[PDB]
Structure 1
């Protein structure tokens, strides 16, 4: 197979040709993007566990000189709050929104979703809330007022990478 450093006339930049080999297998990998050094983005499917508490996600190990980064993005969601299980990538259970007596009623209408994350001691602490129409939820509890706190009725993709 072999390999070599070629050069194209279009511009003034060199290139290391590895396309003769079918796969390049590395351990750690970094590359540059407009002067910044990055590692590849790595993705995980995430949900919150029962109980309305923050979701902890271990931070990836970064090469020397690079800092941990994180982004969470919405995949599926509903206004069911705790009354849900979104932990399967292929099916969702969404029962409905808790009513003032504690029963599961229809799904409420939605006003927003917040996803928040902070890095503490090589752990990302992720929190979320879903805002819903008022007048439905109990006065107190995980799902109360107009807010579904750290809801089960949410799946997000967590992206991590390292960057200078």
Structure 2
């Protein structure tokens, strides 16, 4: 919440998973989009975004192709 305390689970609007390959390392970023006016003005979780959240489990698949 805006006062820094832990509030209820806000409602959700979107999830973005982004990945880019650079020299033998896959770089994965995430952002969970939630209702605004709940998160503080600045920080990791700010405005309408939870940036690279721990509240997310994803399965990473790898394979090779030509």
TM-score (norm 2): 0.99
Q: How many residues align?
A: 66
Q: Over aligned residue pairs, what C-alpha RMSD do you find?
A: 0.3
Deviation at 1:120, TM superposition (A): 0.7
Can you list the C-alpha shifts for 1:65-117, whole angstroms capped at 9, x where unaligned? Answer: xxxxxxxxxxxxxxxxxxxxxxxxxxxxxxxxxx0010000000000000000
TM-score (norm 1): 0.40
Q: Which structure has the larger Rg? A: 1
Three-state SS of the structure 2 residue aligned to 1:112 is strand
After the TM superposition, which segments of 4 or more aligned residues of structure 1 sit over 3 Å from their partners?
none
Three-state SS of the structure 1 residue aligned to 2:57 is strand
- Determine whether 1:145 maps to 2:44: no
CA distance in 1 between partners of 2:25 and 2:36 (Å):
34
Q: Which runs of no fewer than 5 residues in structure 2 stay unpaired? A: none
Q: Which runs of no fewer than 5 residues in structure 1 stay unpaired? A: 1-98
CA distance in 2 between partners of 1:133 and 1:105 (Å):
13
Deviation at 1:150, TM superposition (A): 0.2
CA distance in 2 between partners of 1:122 and 1:160 (Å):
12
